[PDB]
Amino acid sequence: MKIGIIGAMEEEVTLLRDKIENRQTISLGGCEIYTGQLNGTEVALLKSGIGKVAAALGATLLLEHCKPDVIINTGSAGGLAPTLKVGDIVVSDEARYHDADVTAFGYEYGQLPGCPAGFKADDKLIAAAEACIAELNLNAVRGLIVSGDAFINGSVGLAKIRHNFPQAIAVEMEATAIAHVCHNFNVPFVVVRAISDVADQSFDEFLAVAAKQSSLMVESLVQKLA
Template sequence: MPKPLIAIIAAMQPELDYLLEQLDNRQDSVAGAVHFHRGEIKGVQVILALSGIGKVNAALTTSIIIERFMPDYIINTGSAGGLKGGIQIGDVVVGNEVAHHDVDVTAFGYVLGQVPQLPPRFFSNQHLIDAAKQAAQVFTGARIHTGLIVSGDQFIGTAEQNRFIKEKFVDVVAVEMEAAAIAQTCYQLNTPFVIIRAISDNGDANASISFDQFLQQAGRNSAQMVINLITSNLKMS
């Protein structure tokens, strides 16, 4: 049986570096401003891409990957702010649900975060969620959490922002700036996905300091979890 081709997207270089270090038989290509690196990680065929920060960059990169490479799965890796009580810096979050926190068309009867004509939340592929749970059993780098990740084009670094998101999305686990755009693009282009993020800060007044200090650790933890996932006997989608 042929092995799946897996595309892995990160927004920032420190979130991609560990994966690049593990990449064998590397072939580089460029589309517009987006650089792609194709090869193998522990025998698994992968495409690594650096999207840049924010939802437009993430959606653009995801669209190009799907059109050009037709991957079986897409994984978004990187850092996030932890909003769930008890979550710690370095912990890994598997996003089984993803939503926009900065979309508001509620005046027309939509749920906060819902893009018109689309669902209010996007769901990661169940096969990838199951593989992530299997990978978590042998992952010793940090604790693993599963739940809702929300995205917006803003860095959450104040108590007011933190409080607003937790009030409006009561089951939120983490917040970042790309996942919902990747999830929405995958949904619209019928490509299975999962979001894997590690915590770099707590989305509070100290977030910018914590983010700078722990970005590399978070990027590595997330990348290690991704490697565990893709080597867990994933089948074709």
């Protein structure tokens, strides 16, 4: 089993990279992929690009060149569900584009031609991730994650998202693009995001902590799936 890891938190990627044994660095399309073993398990690690296309570019290179069995995609996200708190860890049951609209042709909002309305995370990965999170004494919340090429900052942006996806619990900029590429490559995936802020509610205190714990979560999830 080979596990692909795509992380958006630089510190998490560094922490994991430094732990890889027999580390090899592959440079393609302006991306760097680290391969080797993490506690005996073969892995392929990549720092996530920003936005749908850059994230898709890196994921495509990794999936094609390393051909992993599964993808674990980590990062941070803004919370949409009111019951969330900074530090919570959301686990995707599915991912949708909040900025895709071809409804004029009968497609469901957010759905793109040739794709399902939402991209489903693998049941086994979801369960394993949720178990690894609880073991670290952290709080995991399962649900719909939406993404788009926009940094949601104001009320209007949030309103549109909550209106189109009242069930969405988190939002960011790369999750659905990675799920989409994984879907097209028929590779199981799970998206996990530490909640950095909540829509209607310290930097280091969050990022320093989230990145470290996410890396431990990944290490634990890799061994579990192994």
